[PDB]
């Protein structure tokens, strides 16, 4: 089908453009598609890009509009007072503003389908909403429509929602074009997706990106594949990985590094309305917050993540219990059997389940996958699925049997309801991952596990030392291994906050000198330095010139391999904002060789100050470009929960930064 109207290069400079004569009498039938390529790098707070309205006195509420906000939100209104219909559909964080100093051409496709009674919006190749209604209102069947407008809506003769931006191309069709047809429309995206809705994970949501450049040149990424909306644990979340062998140009279909199967991997559209949006999968085990390092010694890749038993997250984890029992200098995983009121069991060497009241082995063992065996025979549990068919969240058995795991709700033997850290390794650079092992507790029997800092671990350049930053109340707790992650020791570093989410990332400034940058509750990013490969740590200082919110956001950090302005360089990625998670920046600092202080010299705005930027991952690609995988939305805001395909990847060169 050919367009019934096509036009382009319209400048919207706070003055609408009337295209009624060109468009109105071409509109026919009850189904329409609008295709629009547009730029808006300095949008007004709220502005219409396109409008069809009744401009007459008395009919102010009779119009169709496609509108955007300076927050990045896109949406439509479809309104007809006579019909008693006022439809508004939208999604936050759907737009790009600028990339590498140039306004981004967004590609918008809106489909109004009378046959299916469905309105669907795509932006930059991503479906941001699809809504079916009982009473369909065709966009050009609004009573008394007499104006077609760009850059405003004509209401009662006056310009409402005046726009600043440009419409490079606009086309309309008297048909609802298929999803297939939509896929053929060319895009001008400044970004790519590594993980995405409908991929191999079957998670509709993702959070907590990581990136790490391996010695082979392979670039590896990990992520929370989150099934029950974007909620932190408790939920169902797996850890997924993908890699690129061509400097980030293309990426492998994701596989899992850590997964549980007590609940089905379901691609679910999580409700965003105020009544149901806090619906949360409450009986599933999960993993959350991963971190990657490569070991030069063995060549193995190592990935850690937090582990949460069924129904457990940070909010309800038992804080006074590691989940392990100390018996003769060694730590053993505690287990509670169905029916008991105490944890009367432990898991000893070779997975033998021991009875603590009788100090005798049982006929039960735990295999490498933390699954329960009786007499060497695999026990099973029935898997759960979730649905909203009854109007609220339901979690129910689905008929399928899966191996019984001690992290599950339905297991005969269950671990302590608290948080743990696990580790897995890969011997083929992310092509497959081993079964995960639990790390031991580092701060005693009666202290819950520390929390992994998402992102990268640190491999020291001049030794075989590996360090993973973690945090808990009152300190950073660095985990240190000198034997390829076979054994770990802690190095504690006090910080001046209680109960902070002190997400920390490290860079090696020079041989044995580690600077750690971390999130606080002060509105400023902090740092500390070690000069002995992580054995001891300095007092805490703070970075000026960057602002965060009171609650803070993860900061990612790397040491760049090449000199910049003749100096060693570190690069930080963070939102720069005191208001919310937005205003994403890369900040380039040069190291003063005389005292290791850093002059934060260059700031690169990832996109508009008002557009979303939350958790982030950066890595120096093998060709010396910079890869950034980041949450392009406000992942703190309760208005921006459960958005799909907002974790995005871009490629930058150093010259773009400076």
Q: Compute the C-alpha angle 328/329/331, nearest 5°.
A: 95
Catalytic residue among 370, 527, 615, 649: 615
Alpha carbon separation from 302 to 201, 287, 459, 481 (Å, rounded): 20, 16, 11, 11
- Round to whole Å and give the CA distance between 111 and 181: 11
Longest dimension (CA), the chain: 90
Question: Is 615 a residue of the active site?
Answer: yes
CA distance 539 to 537: 7
Nearer to ligand OPX, 284 or 291 (CB): 291
Count of residues engaged in binding ligand OPX, rule: CB under 6 A = 9
Q: Which is nearer to ligand OPX, 327 or 563 (CB)?
A: 563
Q: State the nearest-atom distance from the C-beta of 646 to ligand OPX, in Å.
A: 24
Nearer to ligand OPX, 261 or 456 (CB): 456
Comparing CB distances to ligand OPX, the nearer of 317 and 514 is 514
**How are beta strands 286-294 and 455-456 bridged, if at all?**
parallel
Task: Report, in Å, the least distance between residue 132 CB and ligand OPX.
Answer: 45
Q: Which residues contact 321 (CB under 8 A, 6 or more apart)?
A: 416, 418, 445, 446, 447, 448
Give the C-alpha separation, 644 to 125, whole Å.
Answer: 12
**Is the torsion defined by CA of 138, 144, 146, 149 positive or negative?**
negative
Known binding site: residues? 207, 519, 581
Site for ligand OPX in 546-565 (CB under 6 A): 558, 561
The 363-402 site mask, x for binding ligand OPX (CB under 6 A), equals ----------------------------------------
Sign, CA dihedral 12-15-20-22, equals: negative
Q: Tell whether residue 126 is a contact of ligand OPX (CB under 6 A).
A: no
Q: How many other C-beta atoms can be found within 10 angstroms of the C-beta atom of residue 267? A: 14
In angstroms, give the least distance from the CB of 9 to ligand OPX.
42
- By beta-carbon proximity to ligand OPX, the closer residue of 119 and 478 is 478
- In DSSP notation, 95-149 reads ---EETTEE--EEEEEEEETTTTEEEEEETTEEEEEEE-SS---TT-STT--EEE
Nearer Cβ to ligand OPX (109/628): 628
CB of 509 to ligand OPX, least distance (A): 12
Least distance (Å) from ligand OPX to the CB of residue 453? 14
Distances, alpha carbon 19 to alpha carbons 6, 25, 26, in Å: 11, 11, 11
Q: Tell me the sheet residues that pair with 307.
A: 287, 420
Q: How far apart are alpha carbons 194 and 154 in whole angstroms?
A: 41
Identified binder of ligand OPX from the candidate list 304, 459, 479, 590, rule CB under 6 A: 459
**Any contact of residue 456 with ligand OPX (CB under 6 A)?**
yes
Residue 589 within binding range of ligand OPX, rule CB under 6 A: no
Query: How does DSSP assign 45-84, residue by residue?
Result: SEEEEEEEE--STT-TT-EEEEEEETTS-EEEEEEETTTT
Q: List the catalytic residue out of 77, 232, 262, 631.
A: 232
| Burial category of 326 from C-beta neighbours within 10 Å (exposed 0-12, middle 13-18, buried 19 and up) | middle
Minimum distance of ligand OPX from residue 289's CB (angstroms) = 18
Q: Which is nearer to ligand OPX, 317 or 571 (CB)?
A: 571
Nearer to ligand OPX, 109 or 459 (CB): 459
Site for ligand OPX in 261-290 (CB under 6 A): none
212 binds ligand OPX (CB under 6 A): yes
Rounded least distance, CB 423 to ligand OPX, Å:
18
Binding mask 603-642 for ligand OPX (x = CB under 6 A): ----------------xx-x--------------------
Q: State the residue number with the nearest CB to ligand OPX.
A: 213
Cα–Cα dist 257/574, whole Å: 26
Phi first, then psi, for residue 25 (nearest 5°) are -80, 0
Spatial CB neighbours of 174, under 8 Å, sequence gap ≥ 6? 1, 4, 26, 27, 28, 29, 31, 32
Instruction: Return the number of the residue (543 or 558) whose C-beta is nearest ligand OPX.
Output: 558
DSSP line for 548-599? --SS----EEEEEEEEETTEEEEEEEEE--SSSSB-EEEEEEEE-TTT--EE
Min separation Cβ 451 and ligand OPX, Å? 21
CB of 294 to ligand OPX, least distance (A): 7
568 binds ligand OPX (CB under 6 A): no
Q: Which segments are annotated as binding site for substrate?
A: 207, 519, 581
Nearer to ligand OPX, 140 or 301 (CB): 301
Question: Cα-atom radius of gyration of the chain, to the nearest Å?
Answer: 27
Beta carbon of residue 633, minimum distance to ligand OPX (angstroms, whole number): 25
Binds ligand OPX by CB under 6 A, chosen from 213, 230, 244, 576: 213
> Which is the catalytic residue, given 127, 289, 371, 503?
503
| Backbone CA torsion sign across 506, 507, 513, 516 | negative
Q: What is the sign of the dihedral through the CA atoms of 200, 201, 203 and 205?
A: negative
389 catalytic? Reply is: no
- Is residue 503 flagged as an active site residue? yes
Cis? peptide before 234, omega within 30° of 0: yes
Q: Which residues are catalytic?
A: 232, 503, 615
Interacting residues toward ligand OPX by CB under 6 A: 212-213, 456, 459, 558, 561, 619-620, 622
């Amino acid at each position: 089908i050919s367009p019934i109207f096509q036009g382009g290069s319209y400048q919207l400079n706070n003055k609408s453009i009337d295209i009624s004569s060109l468009l109105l009498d071409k509109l026919s039938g009850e189904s329409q598609t609008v295709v629009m390529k547009f730029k808006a790098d300095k949008p007004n707070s709220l502005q219409a890009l396109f409008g069809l309205s009744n401009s007459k006195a008395g009919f102010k509420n009779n119009y169709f509009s496609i509108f955007m906000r300076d927050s990045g939100e896109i949406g439509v209104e479809i309104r007809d007072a006579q019909k008693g219909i006022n439809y508004l559909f939208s999604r936050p964080a759907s737009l790009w503003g600028k990339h590498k100093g140039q306004a981004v051409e967004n590609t918008l496709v809106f489909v109004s389908d009378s046959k299916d009674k469905t309105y669907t919006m795509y932006v930059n190749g991503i479906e941001v909403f699809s809504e079916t209604v009982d009473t369909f209102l065709p966009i050009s069947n609004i009573n008394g429509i007499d104006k077609a407008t760009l850059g405003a809506v004509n209401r009662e003769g006056k310009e409402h929602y005046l726009a600043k931006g440009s419409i490079d191309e606009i086309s309309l069709f008297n048909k609802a074009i298929s999803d297939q047809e939509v896929s053929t429309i060319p895009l001008s995206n400044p970004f790519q997706l590594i993980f995405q809705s409908g991929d191999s994970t079957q998670a509709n949501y993702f959070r907590i990106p990581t990136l790490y450049t391996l010695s082979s040149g392979r670039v590896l990424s990990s992520i929370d594949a989150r099934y029950g909306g974007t909620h932190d644990s408790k939920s169902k979340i797996n850890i997924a990985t993908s890699y690129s062998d061509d400097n980030g140009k293309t990426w492998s279909e994701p596989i899992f590094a850590m997964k549980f199967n007590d609940y089905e991997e379901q691609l679910v559209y999580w409700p965003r309305d105020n009544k149901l949006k806090n619906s949360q999968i409450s009986g599933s085990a999960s993993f959350i917050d991963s971190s990657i390092v490569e070991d030069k010694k063995s060549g193995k890749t190592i990935l850690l993540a937090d582990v949460m038993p069924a129904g457990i997250g940070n909010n309800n984890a038992n804080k006074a219990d590691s989940g392990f029992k100390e018996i003769n200098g060694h730590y053993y995983l505690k287990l509670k059997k169905n029916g008991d009121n105490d944890f009367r069991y432990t898991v000893r060497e070779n997975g033998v389940v021991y009875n603590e009241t009788t100090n005798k082995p049982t006929n039960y063992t735990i295999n490498d996958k933390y699954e329960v065996l009786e007499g060497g025979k695999s026990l099973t549990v029935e898997q759960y699925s979730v649905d909203f068919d009854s109007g609220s969240l339901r979690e129910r058995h689905n008929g399928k049997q899966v191996p019984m795991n001690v992290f599950y709700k339905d297991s005969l033997f269950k671990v302590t309801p608290t948080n743990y850290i696990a580790m897995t390794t890969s011997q083929n650079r992310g092509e497959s991952w081993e079964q995960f092992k639990l790390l031991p507790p580092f701060l005693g029997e009666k202290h819950n596990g520390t929390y992994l800092c998402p992102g990268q671990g640190l491999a020291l350049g001049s030794s075989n030392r590996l360090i993973f930053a973690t945090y808990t109340s009152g300190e950073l707790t660095y985990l240190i291994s000198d034997d390829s992650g076979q054994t770990w020791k802690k190095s504690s570093a006090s910080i001046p906050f209680k109960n902070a989410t002190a997400e920390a990332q490290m860079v090696e400034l020079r041989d044995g000198v580690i600077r750690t940058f971390f999130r606080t509750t002060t509105g400023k990013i902090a740092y500390m330095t070690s000069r002995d490969s992580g054995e001891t740590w300095s007092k805490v200082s703070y970075i000026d010139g960057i602002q965060q919110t009171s609650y803070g956001t993860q900061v990612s950090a790397i040491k760049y391999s090449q000199l910049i302005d003749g100096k060693e360089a570190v690069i930080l990625s963070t939102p720069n904002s005191r208001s919310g998670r937005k205003g994403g920046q890369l900040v380039v600092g040069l190291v003063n060789k005389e005292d290791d202080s850093i002059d934060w010299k260059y700031h690169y705005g990832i996109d508009l100050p008002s557009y979303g930027y939350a958790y982030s991952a950066i890595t120096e690609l093998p060709n010396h470009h910079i890869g950034v995988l980041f949450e392009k939305y406000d992942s703190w805001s309760r208005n921006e929960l459960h958005l799909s395909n907002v974790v995005q990847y871009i490629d930058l060169e150093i010259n773009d930064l400076t």
